[PDB]
C-alpha cells in the first residue's frame, strides 16, 4: 500500500504545516501537524476542556463506531517550545492520503497549553519520530508510520514541504518526479528516538564550504533551523545590522536587508536554502525589525534541521531495519 497527502502552511510565514487525517467511522477529518520530532498522535476532542478549545475541529470518539477506549492508558507530552498536552487514549481507524491503519492509538486531549488553544488551525499532532518516544502509559503505543510499515510497498515516508506553498507527505514510495538530481542518503542514530544525523558542513551565501560535522535532527515539527552559535554568528555577520536580541528571543535583522543563502552538507552533496526562506518577517506588526530563520541551538542541547532547512529539500525518512535519511534538491 501507499498514501499521499498534501500538506499546507498554516500562515503566510510557514510557521507550521497541516495535513488532513481521517479518524474513525464515519470519517472525522482533522488537520494535524506531522511532526518527525515526536511520536504521539494526539487530537483536540470532545474531552478537551471547553475553555481550551478555540476554533479547532474536534474528534468525538462516541460518534465513531470503530473507536474503543484503551482502558487505563494516559498520555502527557511537553515539547521543546514549552507547550504541552495530556489526556486519555482510544484506538480507532486512521487514514492519511488513502493509507489506512486500523487500531491506531489516537490520544484524546483533556488538556492543552495556551499555544495550542491559540492556534485555531492545528487540530493535533501526528508524530513520526521513533515509537520509543511515545508517551502513552502504562503501555507505550506505536506511531502511524510504525503501524503502517509492514503494509507499505517500501518502508519509507517522504517530506516535500513547500516555501509559502503546499507540499506533500508520501508513505510507501519515493516519487522520482518530485526532486532533481539524485538522493543522497546518510546514516541515522535512533539512540535519542529522533531522525538524528550528521551534516558534513555549511556555507554562507557564495562563501567557501566549511567542512565540519554537525549532529542534529530532521524535525518537520520545528519551524526554524537551529545550529551551533559559531555557525549562526557566521551567517548573521553577513547581514548588515543583524544582531542577537535577548528581548526578542534571537537574531533579528533589518527588514530592508537581502538575506544570503545558507548551504548545508549531506555527505558530499549540498542543499541550498535560499535567503528568502530565512525571513520570518516583522517581530511585531509594523516593525522594521525582522526575525531570522536561522537561530542558535545553544541551550536546546541539540541542533534542529526544522522546516527552514527541510523545505529546501525532498527528504526521505527510510524506516528500513537500519534507518537512514535521504536528501535531494528540488
Would you kindly state where each structural domain of the chain is located, as residue ranges?
5-174, 175-330
> Is there a cis peptide before residue 181, judged by omega within 30 degrees of 0?
no
Distance CA 202, CA 31 (A): 35
Question: Residue 8: beta bridge partners?
Answer: 18
User: Coil, helix or strand for 104?
Assistant: strand
Distance CA 283, CA 287 (A): 6
Which one, of 191, 88, 68, lies nearest residue 137 by Cα? 88
Query: Which of 38, 45, 108, 199 is labelled catalytic?
Result: 199
Domain 5-174 CATH (choose: 2.40.70.10, 3.40.120.10, 1.10.443.10, 2.40.10.10): 2.40.70.10
Which one, of 178, 296, 162, lies nearest residue 226 by Cα? 296
Question: Residue 158: beta bridge partners?
Answer: 170, 316
* Resolution value in angstroms: 1.0
Q: Describe the strand order of the beta sheet including 289-292 as a list of residue ranges.
A: 243-245, 250-254, 289-292, 279-282
What nine digits make up the cell of 74? 494516559
Q: What is the CATH number of domain 175-330?
A: 2.40.70.10
Distance CA 109, CA 130 (A): 21
User: Coil, helix or strand for 317?
Assistant: strand
Whether the CB-CB separation of 221 and 33 falls below 8 Å is answered with yes
The verdict on whether 88 is a catalytic residue reads no
Distance CA 75, CA 103 (A): 17
Which one, of 221, 174, 198, 216, lies nearest residue 315 by Cα? 174
User: Coil, helix or strand for 113?
Assistant: coil
Distance CA 87, CA 299 (A): 29
Is-same-fold flag (5-174; 175-330)? yes
Which one, of 323, 9, 311, lies nearest residue 160 by Cα? 311
Query: Which of 14, 35, 123, 219 is labelled catalytic?
Result: 35
In angstroms, the first-to-last Cα distance of the chain is 25
Please list, in sequence order, all residues whose beta carbon lies within 8 angstroms of the beta carbon of residue 244, skipping any fewer than 6 positions away. 236, 250, 251, 252, 296
Distance CA 122, CA 116 (A): 7
CA angle 60, 63, 64 (to 5 degrees): 95
The verdict on whether 146 is a catalytic residue reads no
Distance CA 302, CA 175 (A): 31
Distance CA 151, CA 134 (A): 21
Amino acid at each position: 500500500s501507499t498514501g499521499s497527502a498534501t500538506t499546507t502552511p498554516i500562515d503566510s510565514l510557514d510557521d507550521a504545516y497541516i495535513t488532513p487525517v481521517q479518524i474513525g467511522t464515519p470519517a472525522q477529518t482533522l488537520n494535524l501537524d506531522f511532526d518527525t520530532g515526536s511520536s504521539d498522535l494526539w487530537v483536540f476532542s470532545s474531552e478537551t476542556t471547553a475553555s481550551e478549545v478555540d476554533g479547532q475541529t474536534i474528534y468525538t470518539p462516541s460518534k465513531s463506531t470503530t473507536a474503543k477506549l484503551l482502558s487505563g492508558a494516559t498520555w502527557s507530552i511537553s515539547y521543546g517550545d514549552g507547550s504541552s498536552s495530556s489526556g486519555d487514549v482510544y484506538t480507532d481507524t486512521v487514514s492519511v492520503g488513502g493509507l489506512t491503519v486500523t487500531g491506531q492509538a489516537v490520544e484524546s486531549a483533556k488538556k492543552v497549553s495556551s499555544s495550542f488553544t491559540e492556534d485555531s488551525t492545528i487540530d493535533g499532532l501526528l508524530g513520526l519520530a521513533f515509537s520509543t518516544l511515545n508517551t502513552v502509559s502504562p503501555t507505550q503505543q506505536k506511531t502511524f508510520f510504525d503501524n503502517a510499515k509492514a503494509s507499505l510497498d517500501s518502508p519509507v515516508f517522504t517530506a516535500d514541504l513547500g516555501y509559502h506553498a503546499p507540499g506533500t507527505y508520501n508513505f510507501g514510495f519515493i516519487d522520482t518526479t518530485a526532486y532533481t538530481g539524485s538522493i543522497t542518503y546518510t546514516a541515522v542514530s535512533t539512540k535519542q528516538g529522533f531522525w538524528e544525523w550528521t551534516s558534513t558542513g555549511y556555507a554562507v551565501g557564495s562563501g567557501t564550504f566549511k567542512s565540519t560535522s554537525i549532529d542534529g535532527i530532521a524535525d518537520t515539527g520545528t519551524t526554524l533551523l537551529y545550529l551551533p552559535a559559531t555557525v549562526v554568528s557566521a551567517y548573521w555577520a553577513q547581514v548588515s545590522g543583524a544582531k542577537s536580541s535577548s528581548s526578542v528571543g534571537g537574531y533579528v535583522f533589518p527588514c530592508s536587508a537581502t538575506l544570503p543563502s545558507f548551504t548545508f552538507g549531506v555527505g558530499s552533496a549540498r542543499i541550498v536554502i535560499p535567503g528568502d526562506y530565512i525571513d520570518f518577517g516583522p517581530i511585531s506588526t509594523g516593525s522594521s525589525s525582522c526575525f531570522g530563520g536561522i537561530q542558535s541551538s545553544a541551550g536546546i542541547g541539540i541542533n534542529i534541521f526544522g522546516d527552514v532547512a527541510l523545505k529546501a529539500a525532498f527528504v526521505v525518512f527510510n524506516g528500513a531495519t537500519t534507518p537512514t535519511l535521504g536528501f535531494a534538491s528540488k
